[PDB]
Every structure is written in structure tokens, then in C-alpha cells.
Design a protein around this nucleic acid. Structure first.
Ligand code: MG
Lengths: 106, 95, 82, 96, 95, 106, 96, 87
DNA sequence: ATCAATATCCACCTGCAGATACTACCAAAAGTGTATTTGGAAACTGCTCCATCAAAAGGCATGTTCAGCTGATTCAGCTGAACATGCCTTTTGATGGAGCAGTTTCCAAATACACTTTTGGTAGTATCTGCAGGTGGATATTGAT
DNA sequence: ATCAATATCCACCTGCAGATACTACCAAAAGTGTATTTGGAAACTGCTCCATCAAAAGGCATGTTCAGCTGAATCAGCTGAACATGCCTTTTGATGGAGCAGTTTCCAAATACACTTTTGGTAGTATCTGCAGGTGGATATTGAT
């Protein structure tokens, strides 16, 4: 017995995704590739964020990723930021940013 | 008692592919889990609508692909489509 | 020292929020406006979470009740389930 | 006898809190506000400890971001001091 | 020559009940038709999610009712609930 | 042969509403009361908006409601306005409203 | 040779255009703009006329609302003259 | 068969007068002269987003013709729901 | 400028909260194989409505002129920032019991289906009417003086 | 104030496209009346984890002081509104056919059990470590002079 994830080349669970789609009342029926595709899509997006969050941990002398790293990752990327533009990551604070006119004279 | 499901293990696996020496807090994993469910619902939702618009009873990879295009910003959409088209191929080209 | 609850949200803590939001100087009328605004936010959200509570026939407002409420108000929150 | 100039601490505070993520309202006074408010929609009500947390994370994320827009509205009027009209304008434009 | 359905005749009935000497343009009707489909989908959606959230598989009047309390603002909700409660009561009374 | 609409006291069509609920894939099963309630709600709402539009019609010395009358109705009503706050009514125009400072002299 | 002072015709036009609902961009130019932009996304596309009308209704309502907000940003700044900075602040606050 | 004329610069068909009318309906009295280009730019972005999404629906359905429903559905996604055209 | 108060930095140290790792175990997925069902591409073509192309029709572009708005400059006052000196609230941990969540029962309400009736839509040919655009006539508003 | 140029009002008046009105027709919807399945309520119950409260922990309230911001007032330069003029593009209405949508065919792919296998979650334990929160000591920053 070989798992569909392993057939597809994937770490993310094709069977689960299939089940979740059937039980979601998204449509009468579900084709065989759709779970595969969707699962690859979620793996991919997951990786893109962990890549960048990982880097963000490095940049702070840290080996354990915490919310703060996910937030810096996401809000420093134009695309992820837009995808998540209406989402709040608990315990992520904000990007260091100060309006220039608020700086003292130098 | 009840089995509380999550995507956490599948997330951990991908973390190690991508940052083998980096680990993750519980809170951070919960956010990743939130994130996967969210994107799931968004895409699936959009696929459902698509099928309904065209009076179809089935959600196929075509619906998921169009869904993806509609939801993700440019570059992200692009890589995602390729990753999806790919994984479907390996899966067909595999008994 | 019988105190109103909204006032438990204090000048200094408001001031710290503003600081996270990049604010340098703050007019004295802000703290009252800010409480008014937070009340509205919370009425709107709590109402919907509770309505989720009542629906499930519970006496306890769950984190999911809240997360779900946040979601439909356009304020999706990550980290507490769902 | 040594005194920091007005605004210098404001800045130090700005930098300090942008760096961090701890919540910025004391948990208890928050807890009462919530329950006070929730009482008007149903009585005899308990709350998971995480439910209240969600609510605090959200409220703070909301208010912090509102302060950013508010600040933009003040700067727009060639000021550096946030006023109630700045918050009002931001809320008007957001669609609240 | 496929048939396109719409709420027009119902809208029109109801128009007559509230403003007997008043007509409606076809453009103004298309809008009323948008409006009804719109609110239908929104409420049905809310109820969809609500059932899922509580692992129910059946959408009942109870789920509609909540969806209404969630979607509509104060006074409209109160009045809408009356009319829904009472239409049901009455329909159940045919038994 | 009573319709379900008559049975429930409604102008709006319960049979249809039942149908449309099934085909929308909102859930596996659809309770019998659901379409009755939903049809009532929908009927209520259209009645509210026609009341108010009818009045603007009348306020403008007309007898046939056009979309401007719907827009006047919706936007002058706090609650309909909010319900329809992210909605555009084609051919509605906007409410007459001029900001104070813009007006001439003192 | 009579002369209305600055503002007087403007207020006249405001009253007029706020009382009517006709579209305000000339139809055919708008249609071309649609075709041009669509063609850049994909070629050999045709359009239902009601599709173009839909786009125009949506576009005109969006812009009119944008100018309301924009006007409020100028007035906030103690002006009566909309400027690009106003439109941009609107769009930043709106989430665009 | 024989060859559709070139489309360029049609954005300038959004005339100074017509933009000024829109401003009026929107309650605006005085208009800085840089507004006309800004507005053209903001309109163009609005249309590219609605059209991209509409055309995506068109193609998804294997059609050559962008329908009013395609646009209505795209408007809905974009949170700019429109009544009047098949809602 | 210099000089000193205070903030900020970097290196090193450590204790334990939070994370990894264990295993067992076991229910409920997920996979498999067989039997049955159906959705939707394909081929063909009826028929709408889109692109295209002349005959009618009112808005656009440009330059000229100056009213009045913006934005620069100045300045005084009042209003928030900073910080000392008290006040007291919040946070942390411990400990019963409310209620949520698990589980099993059984029936009222669900889907399934076939067959009979009703309805809402369309089409075709009908004649019906509100109001837009035109008219003219009395009044209102604007801006010069 | 007055006068007079021009918009504004409103009221009624004719033409017609858009609405209403009708009979004929039907497919598909909706109602009805069986046979069959089950989702979720009800009722009892074990166990979190929530409200409660007492012990330990530090932040917020107030008052004084004055730096420096906001807003007022003044002004000039110049941008943007109004309008006169000349030129032509948009609006609208009538045919030829591209493509969309309505048929029917049918098989590749979907669902539906039933049946065998496995994996992901939890619980019991034990095991481990990244890093927050002290440390000291060097250097930068700020502000007074
Ligand atoms: Mg091009």
C-alpha cells in the first residue's frame, strides 16, 4: 500500500484533503486530482512562509521560530502581506516603522 | 478523548526540508495551522463558486487552479500553479 | 474607589498602544475617544460570538465562538484554533 | 538634575514597543470590560481563558493599526499630534 | 430556449400590498432581483458555516434564524425573526 | 393541493426556496422549516425596501419606482444602508450632500 | 457680460450631478479603454454590451465614492481643493 | 477576417470634463490640476483588477466572450457587489 | 567645543518552561477491490447578439483673464511631555464544582421515489399610460455698484 | 440698498417606449402519497478548566514645570475656475455571421459499500535545551554648558 501523498511527491496529506473537501459541501462530487493539486498548493505556501520565517529567526540569533518571526516574514513580503492583508497573527507585533516627519532635527 | 486533528506534523516535515536546523514554538505552529485551514477554505470556497457558476457538479483540479489564480498574487499564484500541475503529473505518472 | 470598567483601560496603556502604532504626541481627548472606539469594537464582536454561544446551547463562550466572530467581521485572527 | 526633551522619550517608547509584541493592556481590567459588555446580550456567562485572549489580541491589533491611520491623518493636516478628529476621519474612511 | 427564473412576480405581489397604486421599472426590478438573491446567498452561507461549525449536517429553521441574527442589524433582524417564527408556527399548524 | 407558501402565509415561493437551498450545497440535508423561514425573511425584506422606495417615488411625484428610488430608500435608512454597505445599485446616483465649509459666505 | 465668481458654477454642478443618475464618462471611450486593458490580458476577446455597462456603473460608483473620501481628506487639511495627496491618503486608509 | 485596429492610450478618453463631473457628483468644489492624471491611474488599476478576474471566469468557462455575469462575479470577489445586471 | 547623566550594547551564565522524544495502543481514518452510477466532452447546429459600419447629433480642447486659495511666515499662548512623589491594583497560584463533552438510545424528521397536478415562464399579438423633454411664464439668485 | 443677467421653478402639453394585458402552450417544477433511513435530541456522567480568592508582585495616579506645538493672522504669488471660441467625435440604428447555448450520445470517471491496513493522535513517561532574564563594563546618545 502506497499513500497518495507519496505517489504525488508530497508531504501533505492528499487523503485528508480529499475527505475535508467531500465533507465541506463545496460540491456534489470531487475529482481525483483536485486533492493532489490543493495539497501541493498548501505545501508550497507553507514552505514559502517557513523559508522566510526561518530566515527571520536566523536574522535575530534564534533557532526556534515564534509568531514574531511569522509576522516579520509575512509583512516584509509584498505578496504574502497582500494575501494576508485582513489577517492578524496573534503575538506578532508590528514592523519597526516611524514616520519621517516625527524624527528630530539632525 | 476526541481526536483533535491538525496539519502540525505535515508542517513540521516541511520545516525540516526547508530549515533542517530550525524548530518552531507551539503558538507559531497554531498560527501555521490556522493559516493552512484558512487558505484551504478560501480556495475550496472559490472552487465551489466556480463550479456553481458553470453548472457543474464536480470540483476538479481545473477549478482549484482557477481558484488559485483568483486568490493569490501574481508570483505566488505562478509557483503554486506549477507546484499543483506538477504534483498531479507525478501522481498520474505513478501506477 | 468604585470605578467604571471602561476606565480600567488606562491612559498609560492607551499611550503604549499608540506607541506601537508609531505615535509621538497625543492630545488629551484621545483617551476617551479611544475607549469609545474599543467599546464599539467589542460590542460588535462579542455580540456575534455570544450569538454563536447561544446557538450551540452553551453557557461558556469558546475561543472558536470568538474566532468565528472575528472572521465574519473581517478580522480573521490566527492562533486560537479553526 | 537632567531632563529629556519632550518627544525624546516618545521616540524611545516607539522603538521599544515596535520591537516587542507583549500585550499592552492589563489582563484583568480587560476581562471585566468584556464580561460587562457581554452581560448585555446574555447573563450568567463563563468564557474560556483563551476566548478572552483572542479578544485581547484582536482588540490590540485593531487599535494599534487604527493608531497608524490616525497618525497618517494627523500628519496629513500638517500636525504631529493625534486628535479625535483624526480617529474619526480614519474610521469614516475605513467604512466604520 | 431556456427559461430564466426570477422573483419578479413575488416582488410585484408584495409591491401591491404596500403601495397599491405604485409600479416598478424593469431596471428597478432587476435590482430587486439582485437584492433577493444576494441576501439569500448571504444567509444560506452563514447557516452553512454555522452548521459545519457545530458538526450538524442538517440546515433547519433554527440555523436560518441565527444566520439572520448574525447578518442583519438590530431592528431588521427583530422584525425578520418575527415573520420567520410566525410563518413556521403557521406552516406547522397545517398538521 | 395547497402550496406550501399558502400553508405558511407567504407570497414568496417556499418550493423554489427549498430547491435552491438543495442545489447550493449548503449542507447534506435541508430541514422542512428552513425554506419557510427563509422565504418569510426574504419577503419581509423586500417589503421593507418597497415601502421605503415607494415613498421616495412619492416624494418625487412619481408613480413608478426606478433604481434611484431604491437608492434613496436604502441610503436614507441606517439599517438597510449598512446591510447594503458594500453594494452598488446600478443607476442609483448618490444622496445630495454638500460639506459645510464648501458653502459660500457666512 | 456677466460673470459668476469662482465656486458658484461648481456648486451649481454639484447640485445638478447629485440629483441625477446618468453615467458621466462618455460611453464609447470607456468601452475602448476596457477593450484595450482586456486585450493586454488576453486577445480575441469579445464583450456583451451589458458587461461593459456593468464595468462602467461599477467604475463610476467607485470613483464617485473615492472623491467623497478624497474631499474629506482635503477638508481635514483645512483646504477646499482636492490634491493627489488626498486621494492617496484615502486609498492608504481604505486598504488599497 | 481582416484585422482589428490598434488600441493605444485610450485612458485619455477619460477626459478632464468627465472626471470633473464625477468629482461633482462626489461633492467636490475645487480641483487641483494634477488630479486628472492621478484619477486616470487609479481608474486603470481598478479596471485591471476587475477585468483580470472577469476574464479569468470567461476563460475558465472556455468562452471568447466576457459576459455580464463574469463581471458581476468578479465585482463580488473584489467586494464591490453590483446589482442590476444578473446579481 | 567639553562634560556628565543616562541609555544602549555586547559577552558571558544559568534554570526551567517549553520542546523534543518516548511507546503503546488503538480508533478511525486511509487504502483497496468490486459493483454501480452519472456528469459532462464530443459532435452537430439552431439562433441570439456581437462586431461592424453609415446617418444623426452636443460635448471637448484651448487660450485668456483674474478671483481667491494655498502655503509661507510670524508669534503667543496653552497643552501635552517629562518626571518627582505617593497610592493602590493586578498577577500569580491553589483549590472546589459547573458545565462541556462523551456516549448510548430510539423516533420524529430526513431522504428516496413514482406518479399526478400545478405553475411560471415565454411567445405572440394585444392595446395601454407615465413621464421625459418640450413648452412658456412667474419667480429666485447672483454680483456689480 | 438698487438693477439686471441668468438660473430656477413649475405647470401643463404631445410622443412614444416601456409597461401592462392577453391567450395559448408546456416543461419542469411542485405537491402528494407511499417505503426506508437516521441525525440529533434527550438523559445520564466523568473530568476538565473556569471562577474564586488569598498571597506576592510594580505599575499607574497625581502635581509641578515648561518646551515646543497648534492655530491665528497676515500676505503674496500663482493655480485653478469661468467662459468664449472652433472643431469633430460620440450616439444611435440597421444587417451578416461568429460563438454560445440547446440538443443527444456514451464512457471514463465518479460514487457506493465492504473489507484490510495504517497512521496520526493521545497519554504516560522521561528527557532535553533554547533563551529570557539576570551580569558587568564598554560605548553611544542626549542635553546642558
Ligand atoms: Mg495592448
Amino acid at each position: 500500500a502506497k499513500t497518495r501523498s507519496s505517489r504525488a511527491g508530497l508531504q501533505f496529506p492528499v487523503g485528508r484533503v480529499h475527505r475535508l473537501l467531500r465533507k465541506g459541501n463545496y460540491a456534489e462530487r470531487v475529482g481525483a486530482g483536485a486533492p493532489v493539486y490543493l495539497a501541493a498548493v498548501l505545501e508550497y505556501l507553507t514552505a514559502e512562509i517557513l523559508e522566510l520565517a526561518g530566515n527571520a529567526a536566523r536574522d535575530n540569533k534564534k533557532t526556534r521560530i515564534i509568531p514574531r518571526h511569522l509576522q516579520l516574514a509575512v509583512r516584509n513580503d509584498e505578496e504574502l502581506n497582500k494575501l494576508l492583508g485582513r489577517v492578524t497573527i496573534a503575538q506578532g507585533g508590528v514592523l519597526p516603522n516611524i514616520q519621517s516627519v516625527l524624527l528630530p532635527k539632525k | 478523548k476526541t481526536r483533535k486533528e491538525s496539519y502540525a506534523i505535515y508542517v513540521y516535515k516541511v520545516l525540516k526540508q526547508v530549515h533542517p536546523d530550525t524548530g518552531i514554538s507551539s503558538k507559531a505552529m497554531s498560527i501555521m495551522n490556522s493559516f493552512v485551514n484558512d487558505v484551504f477554505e478560501r480556495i475550496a470556497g472559490e472552487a465551489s463558486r466556480l463550479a456553481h457558476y458553470n453548472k457543474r457538479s464536480t470540483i476538479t483540479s481545473r477549478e482549484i487552479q482557477t481558484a488559485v489564480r483568483l486568490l493569490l498574487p501574481g508570483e505566488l499564484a505562478k509557483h503554486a500553479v506549477s507546484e499543483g500541475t506538477k504534483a498531479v503529473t507525478k501522481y498520474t505518472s505513478a501506477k | 474607589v468604585l470605578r467604571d470598567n471602561i476606565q480600567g483601560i488606562t491612559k498609560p496603556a492607551i499611550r503604549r498602544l499608540a506607541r506601537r502604532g508609531g505615535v509621538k504626541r497625543i492630545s488629551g481627548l484621545i483617551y476617551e475617544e479611544t475607549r469609545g472606539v474599543l467599546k464599539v469594537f467589542l460590542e460588535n464582536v462579542i455580540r456575534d460570538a455570544v450569538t454563536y454561544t447561544e446557538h450551540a446551547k452553551r453557557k461558556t463562550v469558546t475561543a472558536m465562538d470568538v474566532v468565528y466572530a472575528l472572521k465574519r467581521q473581517g478580522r480573521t485572527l490566527y492562533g486560537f484554533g479553526g | 538634575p537632567h531632563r529629556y526633551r519632550p518627544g525624546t522619550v516618545a521616540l524611545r517608547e516607539i522603538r521599544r514597543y515596535q520591537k516587542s509584541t507583549e500585550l499592552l493592556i492589563r489582563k484583568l481590567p480587560f476581562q471585566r470590560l468584556v464580561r460587562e459588555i457581554a452581560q448585555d446580550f446574555k447573563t450568567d456567562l463563563r468564557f474560556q481563558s483563551s476566548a478572552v485572549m483572542a479578544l485581547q489580541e484582536a482588540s490590540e491589533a485593531y487599535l494599534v493599526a487604527l493608531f497608524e491611520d490616525t497618525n497618517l491623518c494627523a500628519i496629513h493636516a500638517k500636525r504631529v499630534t493625534i486628535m479625535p478628529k483624526d480617529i474619526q476621519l480614519a474610521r469614516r474612511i475605513r467604512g466604520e
